Structures are given as C-alpha cells and as structure tokens.
Amino acid sequence: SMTIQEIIQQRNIRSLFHFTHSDNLTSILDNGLMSRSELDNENNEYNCNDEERIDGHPDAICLSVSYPNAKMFYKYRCLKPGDWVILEINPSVLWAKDCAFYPTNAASNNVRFINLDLMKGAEAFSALFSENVFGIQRDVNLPSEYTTDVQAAILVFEKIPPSYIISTFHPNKESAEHFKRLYPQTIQRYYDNLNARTLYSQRHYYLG
C-alpha cells in the first residue's frame, strides 16, 4: 500500500496551510503552533475561532492540504476584524508528526465518531482525494494536490515547531514588512491587490 510520502509525491503536494488571526503570529513564529489544550496549559495568550470544538480533540492543531478551509476562514474574517494570515507548512508534518486525516471538516458527524486510530495512516490520508466525499463528487479537472472537499482536515496531536513553517502570507505589504523586521530569517509574503485569486479566495474561484 502507498505511504504518506508516496501519496505526497504522486499528487504533487507542496504545501499544508493554517489560517490564523495576525494577533497570534508573533507567538506562533516564536513558539511554533500549539494545540488549544497546550496553549491553555502554558497560559499562552491566543485568539481562537471555535467556541465549541465539536471535533472533540482540543489537543490537536488543525491544518489543510494544498488550500485553506476557505469556508470556515471567510466566516471568521467576517466576524473578527483585523488582519488574517496564512501559514504555509512543510508537507513533512504529515509523516513526521502524529496526524489524523479527515476527508471533511473534523467537526462533521460524518467523520468524528470513527475510532481515531483508523484516521491515522496512509489509508486515511488517501481518502481525502476520493471520487465522492459525503456527497461532494470530485471534479475531473481538479488538480491532484487538492482535496475533494475543501474542508478536508489534518489534526496534529503534537506541537509543530516553527522550523516547519515555510512561509507566511499576509493581506497587505505593511503586515508582511512588520513581521519580516521581527523575523528576518523567515519568508513573509503578501498580496498587493486582494481583488485577485489569492489564498483568501474561495477555492472554486482560485482554480477557475
């Protein structure tokens, strides 16, 4: 059976993504990504989105494969003013860290009741690219690196050190420059015109 690494190679996956409010970025670039449970245990300040955590795994960090969860992301941009950023993360996390793989949002009733052990591993990862995910039929032109359902999720049950963050995307140049000054060894990227296909876009538009 194919390994996680083999699937990455075959599908041309190059990026994992994690959106977050800019309020969190200093702390993430300093300390790495941490779960809600761990931030609470360390008494670290953070700005979270979800007030329910219906997934049931507050000790896990949520990532996306190849494109952010543009639906949940846009919701929280409407609800929380200020700049949002998108962390780009090495696909190596998928094998190097303790990951569970979900073909849709990890809070969905379609996936959250399954034995967590069945969601680890290459078989669970391959399911993110299935021809039909709980009624979403994969488009025949969707490129190989994209999940069938834009909300497909990775839950990472340990910390992600900042060396796995390969770049960070900003919604304006000033935001990127601010963080570049503070973190000169890191890559801080930005869009000048947000009227464009950007990682802030819905995926169907981005790939259109």
Add this chain to the structure above:
DNA sequence: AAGAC
C-alpha cells in the same frame, strides 16, 4: 464567500 452540532 459565512464549519461544525
């Protein structure tokens, strides 16, 4: 363009 229960 607005998850999840």
